[PDB]
Amino acid sequence: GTRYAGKVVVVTGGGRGIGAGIVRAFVNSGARVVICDKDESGGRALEQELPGAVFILCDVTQEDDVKTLVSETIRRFGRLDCVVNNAGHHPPPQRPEETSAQGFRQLLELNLLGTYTLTKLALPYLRKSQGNVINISSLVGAIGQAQAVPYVATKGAVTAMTKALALDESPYGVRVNCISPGNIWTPLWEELAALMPDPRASIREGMLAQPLGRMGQPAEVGAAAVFLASEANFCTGIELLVTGGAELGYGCKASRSTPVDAPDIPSG
Amino acid sequence: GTRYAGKVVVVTGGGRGIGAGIVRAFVNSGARVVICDKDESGGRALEQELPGAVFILCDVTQEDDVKTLVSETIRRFGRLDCVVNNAGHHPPPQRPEETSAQGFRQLLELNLLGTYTLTKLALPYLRKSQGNVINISSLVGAIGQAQAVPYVATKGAVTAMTKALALDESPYGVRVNCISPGNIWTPLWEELAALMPDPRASIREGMLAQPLGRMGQPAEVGAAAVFLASEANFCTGIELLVTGGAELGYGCKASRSTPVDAPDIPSG
Amino acid sequence: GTRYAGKVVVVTGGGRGIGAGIVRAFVNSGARVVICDKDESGGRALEQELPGAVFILCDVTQEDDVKTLVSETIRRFGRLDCVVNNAGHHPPPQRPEETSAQGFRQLLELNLLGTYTLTKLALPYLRKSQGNVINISSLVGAIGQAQAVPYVATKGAVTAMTKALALDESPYGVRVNCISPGNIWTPLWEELAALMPDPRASIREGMLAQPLGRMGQPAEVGAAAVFLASEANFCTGIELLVTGGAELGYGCKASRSTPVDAPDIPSG
Amino acid sequence: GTRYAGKVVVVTGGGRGIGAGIVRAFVNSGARVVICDKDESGGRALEQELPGAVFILCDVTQEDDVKTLVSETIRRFGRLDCVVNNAGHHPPPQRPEETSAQGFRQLLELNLLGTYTLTKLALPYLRKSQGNVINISSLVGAIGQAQAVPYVATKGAVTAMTKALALDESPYGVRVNCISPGNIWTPLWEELAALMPDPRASIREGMLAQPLGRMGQPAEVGAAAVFLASEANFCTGIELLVTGGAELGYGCKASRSTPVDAPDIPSG
């Protein structure tokens, strides 16, 4: 209710999904939240519903949109306490030979360099408030994912960059942390499933990937983000897993295209 | 204020240090807290100061003390929602040849088997409440520590056991997580430093081990424990680092007894 | 052929399975190998087949057997260069309420304290040869396993203890490393599968747990052990995974007893 | 001597440093080695000294140089068994505000997209030989480094991409692994130290960062690469640390610009 009262927070990609869940969580903790999104529709709907959230149209791949975002946040609200780098994209499944260097560069511009550019421009103000940075990475940056080489690379970069930033900003008392969600039910997840030959079977496989037996919710990532900003004052450079246990224990991993022998020859 | 209202929580070793910090954090979130400690002095002082905390004398190495602890918690309060396994001990620095199998067994009884015994007896009740378990492990279970072979082994065991329990209890919706603190200023830390030839130099080295430049506080571990119990509903089997960044980046590691060559022969 | 020529190596549990694979790998690299095993049958068969391997009856849970093992190795061969702590046991599947503190203590005596006791007694001689220690841990010490709380705890302890020993022994130039195998087809694996209601289905599930689509071989762990001893002179405190990729990517983890909802409610 | 006999290996950046160490290690194991380097001087010197190593001028940031590299390797030698992606660069120390998006993009082109482009073009041939890929990442991709945000991001990307590739290529039996070196004494390390106000003090700090008390050698990375290619047939997606223990235990991390209080206030 007052956990982060009067702090100014920027959330990129805050118009839907996990970002909207983070926006709602910070508004509920008393913050002024600047929603950054390339999509006017969801950001305007959130700005009208939530007093304390304002919407600024901004594409994080455009350096001038981000400079204006930071410039307007300071002009209109006088300070900056927390940046949540959430804007990102997961392409449909793609084998390595179905990827291009150009597609990889485009994904790096959004998932990695948008996060880098806003952080860099925000740091002079975060240093003045002893604020903090939260990056939304992914579990698959840590354990890999099939048919997702460009995406996995961008999220490994984000998690590592979080630790480098944590070391660079610790002399100012500025913390830098990341959240690595596993499977979270969002519009992105729904849109990816809808491209599969059996969307609900794909969703069910997504649920069975967790020992808890379900996907996570945006509100659960949101609560983790408010914790990191407002109560984790001795945490920096950590990777907070919000994954339902998906990384634990053995599971069925050998793919449908993978030659697997009968169990009378178990080790080749 | 109401984050964990009416939940029943048992905290072992809750009489001082990190455990007292966890006790205070759960009381402040509205829980009924059962303080388990072998030391009557600190537990009675907390029980008298905090309404909502009660003290039950209990040595977690004694199976009968733990059975009575659980039996009395259910008889007096009717449910059990959260177990925090915090009771533990760090011996003074000891080289491997200065350790004994008997000392190692004694430390396993406290740091590992006390945690196992209470968890096992608590599980039938935690399953009924869809409660959760929080184990207090240590960063050095993950990265090692010099002159601490028995201690490091016990904490590696706790962190791993947390993941095994998370897998076993997920069909009941019971989450099992651990917190791995780094250097936290507690009476244990002060007592260990007081055995060194220069206690304040040792404390200063303990502070410089973190990029943040200080040790953590019990209240910071307490906030992380309340987060795990009350708001991390999609987290299970995670290791929440509360370390000030001590695991990040390069640091000075070659010991004072270690032959290090002059910098004209950098790689032997 | 000459990678580890004339070095003296002790392998505990070397009579069958992974230990026999390590024994054969070190003999093939030119070492004198002392097979330690509580079972005379396999050790005698290996000692007669392999010149350069000798067998010494030894139960690593008995401090006097281990002291005699070390005493006889030095008396008969004059030096000690490498200790491989491989002797260990995996109990059948057991839920937490089906485990006992006494069973847990017995498993700690073998999987953890046998490794500790031999290492401690070997260290004075390893320091003189700048030798090294290799511990055989398990992937599940890192990621957990269902129905295996005591076993998982012992292997988390071994992996952590490896790092503590690495720090303590680095001033002497003595390296301490561990190998964490995943599913390796051994007599232990076969005996555990034979206790299941459908042994070959269990073996097939064990094979499908790896992206590579098979279990590993003892000879593959053996090659990793010879690498660590003979060519990894800048590695200490590492955990060398020999797992077929089992820790990578998403897999089916929600258990058969776990309530999982239909895919029209993906996140509860 | 014959560990990898007749296999065809491409090593990018093989003209000096770690790459030259890998080249020599694969030549010594009997392979045909194609040295890829943008620098003619070192590659020609190695090609003339080592029969079995040939040099092909190639800048991995230029897609046409890489296509020609692969085309010429197959035309001249008929197969491809192993790709070692070693070409990379570490910029001088730079604070985040001293970095540019353009510099970051240039570093991604070399450290990440050069590795991606060659792997993608090599995969059709590696699938036919059941070959393997080895990426040279860095420890700091896992633990972060100060004053190196772009570099750390590129190496986090490489390590993660290694795991994604391992999952995608396991149905073909093609393994993909990475080596994460810590401090290795190379010409790059010497050139970076020479930019410091006290180069030998910087080198000495680099040596003290390891419990072993020295930096590693290119030949030690080379031995690890030959192990991964020739004897680690059950390893895929692993990160093989060649770091001297730098990630273990506590060290001095609070920087010279970091406010650290006197030891009478240890936790703020």
Ligand SMILES: NC(=O)c1ccc[n+]([C@@H]2O[C@H](COP(=O)([O-])OP(=O)(O)OC[C@H]3O[C@@H](n4cnc5c(N)ncnc54)[C@H](O)[C@@H]3O)[C@@H](O)[C@H]2O)c1
């Ligand atoms: N959903 C999951 O399971 C999952 C798992 C792991 C990580 N993540 C990460 O979480 C983040 C959010 O994922 P989501 O599932 O909520 O996605 P989403 O597609 O549902 O929402 C993403 C939002 O970001 C905005 N956005 C996209 N490109 C932008 C740009 N150039 N500039 C500004 N805004 C932009 C979109 O308009 C949208 O409002 C991403 O970084 C994603 O990689 C998601």
Ligand SMILES: NC(=O)c1ccc[n+]([C@@H]2O[C@H](COP(=O)([O-])OP(=O)(O)OC[C@H]3O[C@@H](n4cnc5c(N)ncnc54)[C@H](O)[C@@H]3O)[C@@H](O)[C@H]2O)c1
């Ligand atoms: N202080 C640190 O820097 C640090 C770092 C990492 C982990 N930890 C862990 O945090 C936990 C608490 O540490 P602390 O620093 O607060 O220690 P502490 O000594 O200050 O407090 C520990 C409490 O546990 C109680 N206790 C000890 N043995 C007991 C037993 N047999 N039965 C019941 N209660 C018992 C003690 O009486 C005391 O009240 C331990 O598990 C410790 O290993 C501490």
Ligand SMILES: NC(=O)c1ccc[n+]([C@@H]2O[C@H](COP(=O)([O-])OP(=O)(O)OC[C@H]3O[C@@H](n4cnc5c(N)ncnc54)[C@H](O)[C@@H]3O)[C@@H](O)[C@H]2O)c1
């Ligand atoms: N097989 C796997 O999939 C797997 C996976 C991960 C780890 N491991 C570990 O690898 C090691 C070997 O496993 P395995 O599968 O080859 O087992 P195994 O049962 O096939 O062989 C173990 C050997 O150790 C000996 N041994 C047991 N108790 C002993 C004692 N008290 N003193 C001396 N020798 C003793 C046995 O007699 C036997 O010869 C163990 O530490 C095990 O936990 C195995």
Ligand SMILES: NC(=O)c1ccc[n+]([C@@H]2O[C@H](COP(=O)([O-])OP(=O)(O)OC[C@H]3O[C@@H](n4cnc5c(N)ncnc54)[C@H](O)[C@@H]3O)[C@@H](O)[C@H]2O)c1
């Ligand atoms: N030296 C260390 O301590 C260290 C630590 C961790 C990781 N690494 C990594 O190891 C690898 C080698 O490092 P090093 O220390 O041996 O470096 P180095 O500078 O000594 O050698 C690198 C070689 O790569 C070549 N190269 C550079 N750009 C190229 C391009 N565009 N196309 C083709 N070849 C190119 C250079 O000409 C040179 O021959 C790098 O990927 C580096 O990031 C090094």
Ligand SMILES: [Cl-]
């Ligand atoms: Cl996957």
Ligand SMILES: [Cl-]
């Ligand atoms: Cl230490």
Ligand SMILES: [Cl-]
């Ligand atoms: Cl499992």
Ligand SMILES: [Cl-]
């Ligand atoms: Cl650093």
Ligand code: NA
């Ligand atoms: Na508004």
Ligand code: NA
């Ligand atoms: Na009270």
Ligand code: NA
């Ligand atoms: Na013999």
Ligand code: NA
């Ligand atoms: Na040549």
